[PDB]
Amino acid sequence: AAQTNAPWGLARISSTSPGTSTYYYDESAGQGSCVYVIDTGIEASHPEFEGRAQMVKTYYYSSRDGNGHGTHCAGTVGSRTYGVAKKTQLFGVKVLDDNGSGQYSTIIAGMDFVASDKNNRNCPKGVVASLSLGGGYSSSVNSAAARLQSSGVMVAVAAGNNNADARNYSPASEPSVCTVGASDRYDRRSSFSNYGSVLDIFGPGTDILSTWIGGSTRSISGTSMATPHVAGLAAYLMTLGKTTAASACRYIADTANKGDLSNIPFGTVNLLAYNNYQA
């Protein structure tokens, strides 16, 4: 399948070169997979989600996304126009308040929630969790992400936006999950992207158009935007049967575009997420 005039990041993940604008992908499109977006919530009524999104848990007075961040990330995973995996099922877990903040204890509870809640959902092709959040190093936060991964969920986490080594941030620094840095449309490391040996992969993160609250759209930047590209890619590849939740991060690294990014510090992987789709 071909989506013309796609957001640059979608075109990038199906291309061996920057500078194109059509997204190519297998029409299975993540059908039968599920992606949990652990964030500020999801505006499930947005026409872009087509009834495939739902809130399943909140720790606050509402499950609605009063911020936009979680809706944007969910749109990059799975919206019809802005999403990588256009037929996946999206489940929102609101661990962040409408200012975008959350206590680590709540975030940990949300991760353990997903590890159990997947057993209440129909995801025959597999389960992914997208975590566009983080703060300073916490062994307890890292352990929660490790448990979620161990339970059979492909965990993708943001590297962080400090232009610093991600070893000092959580859950970015957890070795067993997929830690995602950000790149721009010219294949440069995004100016804010964290780096370091703990990164597994880069995805598009600068000037990413996606869904927003109020039935709208906007372009924003962050490792928060790169992470759902990778989460959606994992769901798409799992639906194709090419990999599993336990092996998808490594598979994405195996099949990435290699050595094409600029300003990658010595010792950080130079790997850009790529779907290897042959139309």
UniProtKB/Swiss-Prot annotation:
Peptidase S8 domain span:
7-279
Question: Got any disulfides in this one, which pairs?
Answer: 34-123, 178-249
Cofactor(s) the protein needs = Ca(2+)
Q: Which domain of life is it from?
A: Eukaryota
Q: Name one GO cellular component term.
A: extracellular region
Write down the top EC class of this protein.
Answer: hydrolase
Q: What EC number(s) has UniProt assigned to this enzyme?
A: 3.4.21.64
Residues that coordinate or bind Ca(2+) 2: 16, 260
Catalytic site positions: 39, 69, 224
MF-aspect GO terms: metal ion binding; serine-type endopeptidase activity
Gene Ontology annotations of biological process type: proteolysis
Catalysis performed (reactions): Hydrolysis of keratin, and of other proteins with subtilisin-like specificity. Hydrolyzes peptide amides
Q: How is the cofactor bound?
A: Binds 2 calcium ions per subunit.
Listed A to Z, the keywords are:
Calcium, Disulfide bond, Hydrolase, Metal-binding, Protease, Serine protease, Signal, Zymogen
Q: Which residues bind Ca(2+) 1?
A: 175, 177, 200
Is Translocase tagged as a keyword? Answer: no
Family (UniProt): Belongs to the peptidase S8 family.
Q: What does this protein do?
A: Hydrolyzes keratin at aromatic and hydrophobic residues.
Name the record gives this protein: Proteinase K
Q: Which gene encodes it?
A: PROK
